[model samples]
Target: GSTSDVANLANEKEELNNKLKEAQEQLSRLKDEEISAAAIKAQFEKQLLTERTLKTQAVNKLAEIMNR
Candidate 1:
């Protein structure tokens, strides 16, 4: 009976270790996704700023032409 108890405990420990490893893998994946999302957001904001600047320049050019 004592031997059986030791074997059971060892098995339980192995199972818990596997679960911990899986959880760590999932956490890493989530972190990667978060970083990707942040990068995409930054790129989108930069594009918007560039578009606004171009539009403003175009309007200014048109106004100058009309005045001349």
Candidate 2:
């Protein structure tokens, strides 16, 4: 049975494991990138401010028209 070469699978397993984990880290980075955690918060606050100012102007215009 010495002709039978019994070797534990290693070469590709180790390389593939590392490759997969590296890609997994990069994949998670992209997935986490999808949220923009805090980067988008600043813009949203500005958007809220714009909306509030816009609504106030709209109400004032409506009131002016009603008074007219």
Candidate 3:
């Protein structure tokens, strides 16, 4: 390219770099959110099973418990 094109290229590259940085940051934040959701899902599954077990136990003992 010409000298004018070279100068234009320099400024264009600067904007490109800024745009690239923002995209990279957003991508990283989205990935972090996804991992956080995965961890929360794990906790939900654990608690769900625990609750179901306790509920079943309550159902099994309700009649005997009512006699107390």
Candidate 4:
């Protein structure tokens, strides 16, 4: 009975270790995704700023033409 208990405990420890490794892998993937998401968001913001600037310039040009 004691031998069996020791075997069972070892098995449980191995099982828990495998689970911890899997969790660590998943966390790594999530961290990479988060970094990628931040980069994409920053790119989008830059594009938006450029677009707004262009629109403003065009509007000012049109106003000048109208005034003339």
Candidate 5:
């Protein structure tokens, strides 16, 4: 049971880390594509804002469960 639970968390961590990495890479590519800093900043700021919001919600939910 313990090992399985650890494996699950590790999997979840890997998946989320991959998604975050991809987002950052894409942002870099956009910058390299010579997009104006303002435009790229605006786009990524929105995307990152949404991602960060969801991450916060996830943490909140986890904390809620753990605190139960």
Candidate 6:
């Protein structure tokens, strides 16, 4: 029973770690876009808005978690 408990905790930790990794990867992809040279200026604004929304949501979620 002890061994199984340890294994379960390890698995849960790994899953959460993967979730954090995915979020960082998504942010990196957003940063990689080149709009100046390609004249995709509108996309630059779009990505900024996308990032802003995601950040706001993350902040709010964090706040809710702390309040709980």
The candidate that achieves the highest TM-score relative to the unseen native structure: 4
lDDT of 6 by residue, 1-68 (tens): 99999999999999999999999998777666553435577778889999999999999999999999
Clashing pairs in 6: none
State the C-alpha lDDT per candidate: 1.00, 0.84, 0.97, 1.00, 0.94, 0.88
Clashing pairs in 5: none
Could you give candidate 5's per-residue lDDT for residues 35-55 as a string of tens digits?
677778899999999999999
Clashing pairs in 2: none
Question: 5 or 6: which has the higher TM-score?
Answer: 5
Clashing pairs in 1: none
Off by over 4 Å in 2: 1-8, 37-67
Please give the range of 10 consecutive residues that has the lowest summed lDDT in model 3: 59-68
The TM-score obtained by model 3 is 0.74
TM-score of 4: 0.87
lDDT of 5: 0.94
lDDT-superior candidate, 1 or 3? 1
| Weakest 10 consecutive residues of candidate 4 by summed lDDT | 30-39
Q: Against the hidden reference, what TM-scores do the models get?
A: 0.74, 0.53, 0.74, 0.87, 0.44, 0.44
Clashes by residue pair, model 3 = none
**lDDT per residue, candidate 3, 1-68, as tens digits?**
59999999999999999999999999999999999999999999999999999999998799788889
Give the per-residue lDDT of model 1 (tens digit) for 1-68.
99999999999999999999999999999999999999999999999999999999999999999999
Q: State each model's C-alpha RMSD to the native.
A: 2.0, 4.1, 3.2, 1.2, 25.6, 22.6
**For model 1, what is the alpha-carbon lDDT of residue 66?**
100
lDDT of 1 at 41: 97
In terms of lDDT, which candidate is stronger, 1 or 2?
1
